[PDB]
Amino acid sequence: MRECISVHVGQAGVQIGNACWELYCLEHGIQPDGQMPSDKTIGGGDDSFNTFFSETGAGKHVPRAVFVDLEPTVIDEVRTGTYRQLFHPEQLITGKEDAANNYARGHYTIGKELIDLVLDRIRKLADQCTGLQGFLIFHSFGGGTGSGFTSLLMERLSVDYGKKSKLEFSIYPAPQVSTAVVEPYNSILTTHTTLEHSDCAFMVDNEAIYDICRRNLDIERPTYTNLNRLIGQIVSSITASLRFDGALNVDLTEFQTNLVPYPRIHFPLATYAPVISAEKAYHEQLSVAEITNACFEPANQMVKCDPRHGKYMACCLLYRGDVVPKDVNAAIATIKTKRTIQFVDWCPTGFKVGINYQPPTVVPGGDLAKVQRAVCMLSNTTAIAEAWARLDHKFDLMYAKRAFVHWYVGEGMEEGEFSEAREDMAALEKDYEEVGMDSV
């Protein structure tokens, strides 16, 4: 078992981390006080916590995480919440002034006031780690520090820690619905650092998650908490083999070389298959085929980009629970023989299957009914290029009139970087349409 810290930045990132660390401590057994009710002697010591927890001696297990947000409202609610003894006060770094939905005062002006304290605190976790695999950094592409401060982290963690698998769990803004007005700007100005020192940029937009909660999970009027519980179960298959045993154990370094074909192409999707509510959970049988089929379906995806109008290039399929290998490779066979699901010619192979032995633990009060055989898919398709293209249209419209710029340039940022992020996105879109032609 090895370790990985999780740097949550943004109001979004720490509220995703609120649902994540609730699930994390439940899987192992850590109570909100921070203590495990059974001791390491009793149990034939189970060091499954080590990937996300660290013992102090009195049984006080510790979240290997650093909550950061530059505005003090969403971080003080976890120093006053039920999980206030679990976290460490030095881990919960906060600031005074808002980023105010502005890239410039996330990276250049306000972000420099706390870039020293976080990089010291990453060092504190990294020193006591012995097998630190990856940085699981949670943020959203459509706000302040989640667009800002995370870019200054990505540059600093690469100079300091180098090759340590800088993963990135991220929240893209949606095609139609949006909770900001300046959102196109800070969503393409920060993707410089995303196509730079970050090796696997997982993608979720808020809009697709609402549709899953309505159709499959059968709740109308969903709030932001149910949207974050889905993200927590996404990690818990990505970090399941690092914490629990399985048939095909799959490491965090395994994920990259099994999903990134080219150094520029490093943007996967995420899909949880058996995500149904309890009343329609007596109803479906849910063996193995219907959930292998589920991730491969449009109205189960977690990003508003249809894989049918695109070609797959890499797809690791991670399974948990009571999954039998013959049931997988038959389900692999039956879905590799469907015309609408297209794989590019330079991937004759197909899928990376990962089998785990731990069924997903249900959050009490959560929506998701228990499933004894679950799937968390991490795809990689050319169809993500339409998700980059819809904000490209939206950015090009409100930049040609030079709107909402005097907030940006008058905060420590040069005008030239705006045009640099413009040409940078054209290059990545040209790369994705290039990597998906069939050479013949």
């Binding site: 009710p37 001791d39 002697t41 009793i42 009195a58």
Partner: protein, 609 residues
């Protein structure tokens, strides 16, 4: 399969610390004898058996109520030991409580019975807290620091929250129990610069001070309420090999033992002897018969004593082999004498009242063989050195020794009825034939066929040939008169016992395949093949002198009554826990006696004339 009767038991495993105990009803003793724990009655021959356990038990822990008795066994490293609770009133398993890997060193109960501390393992030492109510675990922590070593002792107090451990590396730590958070909190006791090695704990009756017995020969008294030392031991004239047993009285006194047997009653401030009496063997257990007037002392060379406090006069009530016992043989004619034969010792015993009359010790040496000459004038012995020592029946002097008899030990031995020839086996697989003159003990022939090792010699009723079981799968009927062979009986089992059926025409063979088989003395063919015991192998047999019953015991720790003509089974067992090595029909056909891998001499009332 009618049970015979189990009368009388000799045996005690004194090598465990804190062994022999007397429950507060003051009428029965409790002591461990293998992977079983006995209950011998005070003033009554009545004795019962606590079954269970796989390998040899290392711990006993009886309650202040007497209602609960616990124990703990050793196992192979990597495997999990089993702490077995019991009820003294009904003697039946009520918990298995398996957490500690490796083995156990010590158990202690809570004052009023609701927790058990069972510190276990030189490989996996970690103190745990049990529940006597839920039969389930509560707390858990490493029992020693990373700078210090490992702990082998536990004790409770007069309040059920304290639990105290010492060490062979100095981990004097007074813990405190914290049920709501389910954790324990240690506190190392400062003792100055006195790092010592200590192996025994006792506390006062009013929870004042706990008392230590170190290897240096020093009684360490320390405070559990200020976590500090109070008084060191004897300044001069310190004890011997370290104090291995301490038992604090209801007074301000303490019965301190030693590794030699110097049981001393001393007071607190000087720790100077008041009344000294020397015991044989290193003192491993000092119990109290409740009030403390009759304290029973157990020793590692297993001898249970009986000392009255007001005169310090002893009475040896139990005497045992302290090591593995092999070969029981009876003198010709009479059936009231044994030959209980073990490492470091050769003993004889009176059958009716178990009481030894001669002990023959050859230093740190092992005797795999014993035999009685027909004239009753020499106890022939086969020692691990390679020397055939022949001691005298009375006194115990060495009449003669045959130096360099066999190379790798002399294992199996047998005399002849003419009292002139001693047929000798060997661990190199050699059968030697010696001549016993009045002044010389020469060699006549060296018959060498067996490759591995010889296991059992048997001689017929009027001497012309002998059978020699061997560990390589061969049993040869050597011709004794013309110094040759006669047979090449062969099988795929490591033979461990062979016997001559009276009216000699066929021999019965045993071994590892549990395929008890009659074999003929002519043409050496298979006659029957009985199935021995379904569990392990068969070490030992004896056919009666009327040829109607042959008794059987083996690794299956269990005496088995088998009649001859039909292969039916009149099985009994429920005997002793420890691998039965040899067994012998009494000459008068009145008892059957088996030895075991742990020192234990069992007698059963032989049926079937």
């Amino acid at each position: 399969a009618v049970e015979l009767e189990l009368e009388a038991v000799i045996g005690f495993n004194g090598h465990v610390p804190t062994g022999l105990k007397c429950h507060p009803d003051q009428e029965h003793l409790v002591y461990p004898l293998g992977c079983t724990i006995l209950i011998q009655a005070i003033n009554t021959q009545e004795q019962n058996f606590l079954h269970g356990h796989g390998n040899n038990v290392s711990c006993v822990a009886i309650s202040k109520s007497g209602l609960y008795i616990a124990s703990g066994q050793v196992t192979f490293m990597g495997f999990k030991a089993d702490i077995i609770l019991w009820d003294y009133k009904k003697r039946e398993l009520m918990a298995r409580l398996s957490l500690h890997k490796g083995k156990i060193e010590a158990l202690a109960f809570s004052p009023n019975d609701m927790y058990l501390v069972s510190l276990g393992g030189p490989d996996d030492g970690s103190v745990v807290v049990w529940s006597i109510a839920k039969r389930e675990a509560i707390c858990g922590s490493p029992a020693a620091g990373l700078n210090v070593g490992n702990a082998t002792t536990v004790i409770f107090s007069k309040c059920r929250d304290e639990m105290f451990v010492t060490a062979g590396n100095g981990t004097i730590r007074v813990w405190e129990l914290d049920l709501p958070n389910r954790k324990i909190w240690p506190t190392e006791c400062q003792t100055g610069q006195m790092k010592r090695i200590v192996m025994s704990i006792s506390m006062a009756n009013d929870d004042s001070f706990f008392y230590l017995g170190t290897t240096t020969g020093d009684i360490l008294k320390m405070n559990p309420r200020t976590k500090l030392l109070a008084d060191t031991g004897p300044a001069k004239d310190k004890f011997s090999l370290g104090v291995s047993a301490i038992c604090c009285l209801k007074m301000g006194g303490l019965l301190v033992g030693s590794g030699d047997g110097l049981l001393v009653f001393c007071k607190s401030p000087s720790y100077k002897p008041i009344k000294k009496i020397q015991l044989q063997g290193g003192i491993t257990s000092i119990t109290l018969r409740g009030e403390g007037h009759q304290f029973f002392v157990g020793t590692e060379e297993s001898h249970i004593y009986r000392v009255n406090f007001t005169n310090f006069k002893e009475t040896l009530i139990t005497t045992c082999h302290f090591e593995s016992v092999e070969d029981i043989v009876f003198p010709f004619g009479t059936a009231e004498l044994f030959a209980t034969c073990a490492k470091k010792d050769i003993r004889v015993w009176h059958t009716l009242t178990n009481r030894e009359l001669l002990r023959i010790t050859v230093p740190n040496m092992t005797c795999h063989g014993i035999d009685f000459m027909r004239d009753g004038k020499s106890i022939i012995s086969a020692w691990d050195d390679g020397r055939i020592r022949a001691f005298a029946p009375e006194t115990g002097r060495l009449m003669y020794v045959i130096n360099n008899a066999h190379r790798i030990g002399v294992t199996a031995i047998a005399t002849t009825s003419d009292c002139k020839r001693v047929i000798s086996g060997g661990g190199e697989g050699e059968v030697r034939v010696w001549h016993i003159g009045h002044q010389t003990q020469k060699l006549e022939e060296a018959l060498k066929e067996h490759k591995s090792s010889v296991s059992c010699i048997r001689v017929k009723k009027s001497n012309e040939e002998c059978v020699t079981a061997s560990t390589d799968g061969t049993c040869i009927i050597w011709d004794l008169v013309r110094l040759r062979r006669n047979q090449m009986i062969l099988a795929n089992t490591l033979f461990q016992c062979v016997c001559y059926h009276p009216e000699e025409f066929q021999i019965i063979t045993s071994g590892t395949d549990r395929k008890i088989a009659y074999w003929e003395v002519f043409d050496g063919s298979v006659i029957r093949e009985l199935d021995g015991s379904l569990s392990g192998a068969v070490n030992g047999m004896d056919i009666t002198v009327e040829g109607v019953h042959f008794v059987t015991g083996g690794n299956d720790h269990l005496v088995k009554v088998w009649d001859y003509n039909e292969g039916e089974v009149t099985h009994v067992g429920v005997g002793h826990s420890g691998n039965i090595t040899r067994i012998r029909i009494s000459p008068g056909n009145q008892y059957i006696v088996s030895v075991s891998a742990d020192g234990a001499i069992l007698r059963w009332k032989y049926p079937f004339p």
